[model samples]
Target: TTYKYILNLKFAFGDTNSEAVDAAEAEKKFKQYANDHGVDGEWTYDDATKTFTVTAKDSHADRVRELAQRLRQRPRVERVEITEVTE
Candidate 1:
């Protein structure tokens, strides 16, 4: 019972800003979470745009919800903004 979820993630590093490292780390963690949870997704980073687009297929609502929560809660992240959520 997989469903597609699109996330426009806006994040900030908890401390000093390092776009390269922060973007890399964020992408890594996000992708790992998706893989571990059987989520099929694509994430694109636009430095000039300052945004990340994540399109994922999560098997259940709970899983997608959990990922959303965890993205914000992770230590390296200062904030997680959900720009959109749809079926």
Candidate 2:
């Protein structure tokens, strides 16, 4: 069975002194991450909100959870929220 997941990711600048987060750069990195990890998903970036949304489907639930955890562990990643999941 395949499970669908919606991942809501918020990014932060490593430097507190930084004025703002670069949405384009962050979005590029996220795309690379997803591609490198072979995560089957679509990405949407909301510039005003600075939120990156990923909609993914996978047969293994554990892999999905792992992806979320890994994303949270990154330095520039502020928070990772697994908003929805369905099988």
Candidate 3:
């Protein structure tokens, strides 16, 4: 059976040490990318943490990994982490 998962994406626009980066804009780009790719999932972003949490329901593990891989390729995204959730 398929399972639900939570994917946390961390974004960095430029040098990690630089404070001149804008995470909110990066998040907007990520959402736009998601929309353009037709990825159906609920997304939430935390401004304080600069992290995006995506909730995917009734999806296969392989499919979730594929989506993570695709999202990692985005220029604005610094990292992508996926975790399976049991509830």
lDDT by residue (1-87, candidate 2, tens digit) is 445778777754334455555567656766776666667877776654455666876666676777777777654444667766655
TM, every model: 0.59, 0.59, 0.52
Compose the digit string of candidate 1's lDDT tens values, residues 1-87: 333677666654345545444567667777788777666778776554255667776667777787777665653343465544554
Candidates in order have lDDT scores of 0.64, 0.66, 0.60
Estimate candidate 3's alpha-carbon lDDT, on a 0 to 1 scale.
0.60
The Cα error of candidate 2 at residue 20, in Å, is: 9.3
> What is residue 61's positional error in candidate 3, in angstroms?
4.2
Cα misplacement distance, residue 27 of candidate 2 (Å) = 2.1
Q: In candidate 3, which residue pairs get closer than 3 Å at backbone N, Cα or C atoms, i.e. clash?
A: none
Cα miss at 80, model 2 (Å)?
1.6
The Cα error of candidate 3 at residue 6, in Å, is 1.4
Lowest lDDT sum, 10 consecutive residues, model 3, at 12-21
Candidate 3 lDDT, tens digit per residue, 1-87? Answer: 545767676754434465454556645765676566445677676654455566765344555566667766544435666687765
Clashing pairs in 2: none
Poorly placed runs, candidate 2 (over 4 Å): 11-21, 74-77
2 against 3, candidate with superior TM-score = 2
